[PDB]
Design a protein around this ligand. Sequence first.
Ligand code: CL
Ligand code: CL
Ligand code: CL
Ligand code: CL
Ligand code: MN
Ligand code: MN
Ligand code: MN
Ligand code: MN
Lengths: 333, 333, 333, 333
Amino acid sequence: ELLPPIAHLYELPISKEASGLVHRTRQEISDLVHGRDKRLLVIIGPCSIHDPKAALEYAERLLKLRKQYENELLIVMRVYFEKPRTTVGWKGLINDPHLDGTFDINFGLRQARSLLLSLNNMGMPASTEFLDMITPQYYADLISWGAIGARTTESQVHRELASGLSCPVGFKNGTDGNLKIAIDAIGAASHSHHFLSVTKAGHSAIAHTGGNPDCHVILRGGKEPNYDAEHVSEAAEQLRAAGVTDKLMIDCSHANSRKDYTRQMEVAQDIAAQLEQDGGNIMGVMVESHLVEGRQDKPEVYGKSITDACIGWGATEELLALLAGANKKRMAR
Amino acid sequence: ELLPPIAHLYELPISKEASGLVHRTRQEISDLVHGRDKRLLVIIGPCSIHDPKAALEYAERLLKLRKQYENELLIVMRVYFEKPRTTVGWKGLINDPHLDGTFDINFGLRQARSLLLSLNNMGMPASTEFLDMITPQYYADLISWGAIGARTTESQVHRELASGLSCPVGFKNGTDGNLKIAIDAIGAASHSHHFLSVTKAGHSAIAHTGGNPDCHVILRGGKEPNYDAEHVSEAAEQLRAAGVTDKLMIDCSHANSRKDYTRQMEVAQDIAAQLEQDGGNIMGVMVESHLVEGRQDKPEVYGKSITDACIGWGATEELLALLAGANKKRMAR
Amino acid sequence: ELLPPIAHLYELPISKEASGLVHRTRQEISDLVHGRDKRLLVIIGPCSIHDPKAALEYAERLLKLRKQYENELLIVMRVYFEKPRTTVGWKGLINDPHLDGTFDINFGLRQARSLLLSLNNMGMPASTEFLDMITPQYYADLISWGAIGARTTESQVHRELASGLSCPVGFKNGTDGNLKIAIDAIGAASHSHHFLSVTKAGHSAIAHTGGNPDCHVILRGGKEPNYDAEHVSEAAEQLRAAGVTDKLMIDCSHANSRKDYTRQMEVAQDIAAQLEQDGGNIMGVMVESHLVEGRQDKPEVYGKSITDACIGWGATEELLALLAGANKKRMAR
Amino acid sequence: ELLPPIAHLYELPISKEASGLVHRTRQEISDLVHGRDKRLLVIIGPCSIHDPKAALEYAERLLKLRKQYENELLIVMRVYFEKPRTTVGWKGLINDPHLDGTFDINFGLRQARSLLLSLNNMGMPASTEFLDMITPQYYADLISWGAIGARTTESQVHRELASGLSCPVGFKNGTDGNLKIAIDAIGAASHSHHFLSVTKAGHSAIAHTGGNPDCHVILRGGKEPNYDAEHVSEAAEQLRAAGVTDKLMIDCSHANSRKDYTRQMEVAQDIAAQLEQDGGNIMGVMVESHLVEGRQDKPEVYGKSITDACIGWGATEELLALLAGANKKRMAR
Ligand SMILES: [Cl-]
Ligand SMILES: [Cl-]
Ligand SMILES: [Cl-]
Ligand SMILES: [Cl-]
Ligand SMILES: [Mn+2]
Ligand SMILES: [Mn+2]
Ligand SMILES: [Mn+2]
Ligand SMILES: [Mn+2]
């Protein structure tokens, strides 16, 4: 028996501070997407959330660096509640919050909203992948930036979803490296759509969306990595050719690090060098980071991923300083 | 206001006869999927349905051939109501039945159910692509076989949907030719899932599915076609290695015809030649066919696709006679 | 499952003509309630509807009289779908349309709406008792005048319901003859209320009504009858003292006929005399009339009541000619 | 937007202790309704609840006496959240919890459930008048005894409601003294009914109830008081003639005390005298009591009624000692 969004909205209404932070962070990201500001968006944090307490501890550390580098970097935390599996597997905190096959979705939605509210209230904006068609009504008001995953960028129902979101949306290139699907996605999501959706009261209805003018692509590797200057330039030419923004984000993880978390730093160094030389088509970066590096099958060690391996806190400080220094020079030209 | 499925079900209850046809067609198709019967499933008809009159005229002609070829072929009509676009475009009869950007979804769902009930009552089983998450509750009881399209095979929400459908489901390979995503899809949709869905009364709820044991892959081309014997053999080996059915379906259209409707017949000739020689991994074929060949942007010509170009009626007779003759020989061995 | 009102509204939308007739008739009745017009409202027809066909035949007869007497009388048909029982029994057409304890409420609501639409389309306006809190959303758009029964006039939920209806409403005095509860009810229903109701989509919600300015009392007997000049005079004085309309309706049936249908004419004759002498505080009369007089336990005879006994068609013509002649004289002064 | 009952049930689930108390108390009352136990039910407490804190303080005091008198009296608190008005006014803590015309019904339902859970958790069972058709789903699980008020005992929708409640229900006699309507109500409520209702999820549905076997009448005065032995003997006779339970309850307040709240003591003395002579048909009494006696138009004094005037705490001790003492004697015969 599924509680509707209005139940959770009643227990956890958005605060004045959260609402202000979300509104302005979305505006600020739009500025980067359209080349009006030259700060780098940094979407950074765990591959997935499985423990809100560790998430809050992580966020308080990250908040210090968000503040420190606010003139060069726009730091937003990865707060991912839904995970696309290759076949089957744990789908994330919403689907199965007790991490044990009980699928307590009401609890998971409450936890997701409570965490997001707390994050925004402390001054840390949040990002997530929007995978499910129905869950966004429960928490999209607390999200400053959304992703559509590699496995769903080509999907018309996800392009519809994005078209109705009030935050900027990044579209990842396909799992084998297809960029055109993400360019096409921006085209689709930027227009108005009519489709079936579910209201805050829990009832199906006809949605009519206005289109989302703040979509961009995310380069996340394919059969080969696609983060280097040659790839960026080629993606930018294809973006201009379709008449959509040629400012893009680069994912340091997934198929760009080839699932070796230690190579996220190499990718970030390549990005730093691009920003120093020129790097005019880059508006942001994505990084898989947690309190503790690596991964584990079971949630035994605190602050360590149970999905993709992440860099730890120490590498995270180094990586953020690197990008901030590199971007300060880009902004000086 | 969106009418819930129960409103349409009340006006258009499934009949004894339609219900019997669906049940036995589903079972017959299962038998093909699991290699218990050597008839060839043929999913044939329009790229998209834009005019119920032409649909029922098509059905009337096809029904004769379904019956003529019943010992060699299991003929099921393509009755596709939901169309994935590259970027933007008409998304099908459900989404915009008046073809004029009025998006009269209540009318569209009603007409879709009506057509499907009329088709089944006349003895023609129906197949469709399940693209949307909420629309299936309105008509899935009238569907004998379902496709998940190339653009959504990798999508976890579509694999979830398939896991709860009561008909067999074909998963298409990805738009650039990736077959592994479809094999992964069978493994995912065979399992139980828990996810958010909408009930027949129009309210969101937690769905718990039991898995769909009758999924298979569809070879529909990528950067290159993949219909030939080598590709079929290569796919069957991959299917066996993943522990799933090695009986598959071949699409004569889309990327296998290089989007050229006149090349569907070449593909079918190649399949016929495989069936004559051996062809033991082939359980089905797909064909885009309409009263009149080609395509048009505006619905000016009766019985002519407004989406992908189709072969015409006479070409349809030739293609079905070719496959039935070739499969008669395969079954006789 | 209960279909929501929107299902029925979709199948039986109100026509231009029915809409006009309801609007006009409500306005015309308001004028009577407020003494702007001295025609006599006549709420006439069956105790209860149990057969649509006979109801439409009855309406076709009554229409000729409605037209013949239009300058003196404003004739509106009783089309009562909801029956309040003393302890238990058949609660009317909506609750149990097949008259056999199957409680097929979806069918009953559909049939009630269909009958009302047909009545209005033929030029016959309709009245009913609003007993249930949920059923009115299904058909109130087709009702020109409503009653709150003797057994529910004191009920706060019924007074709230009346406050949100767009038609004039009559409140009957209580079953032992208490008139103050109906005076009290006009007061309550003329005010705005907040309470829980159900939407046209079938979902509970908070209703905020604006009050119904067109309510009045109905004298329907108690322990003793209350139709005479003395009683009318007493009620008018009490009405003025409460600051509400002193124009009232008199029921010729129920406790004013001592539950004996052959006494309705006697009551009508008394009223006729009052109209002739003065009768300034009478705005209307109610009469239980059917094709065939009396009642029956089973629905064996066509056009004969299965609830309270009614006068038959011959007596109906006499009663109406009587009231028209008497009111023509009132109106000439 | 109205939160459905499931939202409140999620925040405030019934505890094991509260569940057991309600279950046990309903059964205990049933035993008194059907003559299996001769303890006297005493429904005692405020006319209406307007301040949860005072209500809990009152309950802590009453609890001590509930335990002290448990062999003679079965004490259950009046926790009335819905108030029927003569015309207009404050309809209770649910309809307008802030006592200022803001009608914050979401808040009021939450506060009502919270108070009820806390009462049950401390060991005090609770009673209320069920006036509205929709609100009971929010808190009926915490109610051990229910009333249908004098203004609604004749109403078929209230009899329907009663037929589906899982607690015993008392039907009050009519405002002018009519006892037959309450006897008819028991008859009606003991039967199965079909009717439209709203589910815990906030959606309209067809309810099919099983009948309520534990209903009884309440004597609360009329044109004349009806608390004495002669009226009780006449009531019992009429009950036996209708074939329903001849055990009844006597309200010491309302039209039995008329314009003197202190007269509840006289009524109680009369009842004590009946219990001492014989008093075999009395199974309960009702008393309006609060921390501080009297009433006020505005909620200025802590623990003093804002609707009907109540006896104060010292008089409450006195009235309960009186009844316990008298009933101890009846029980010893
Ligand atoms: Cl995975
Ligand atoms: Cl009756
Ligand atoms: Cl009826
Ligand atoms: Cl209250
Ligand atoms: Mn990851
Ligand atoms: Mn196509
Ligand atoms: Mn009647
Ligand atoms: Mn009171």
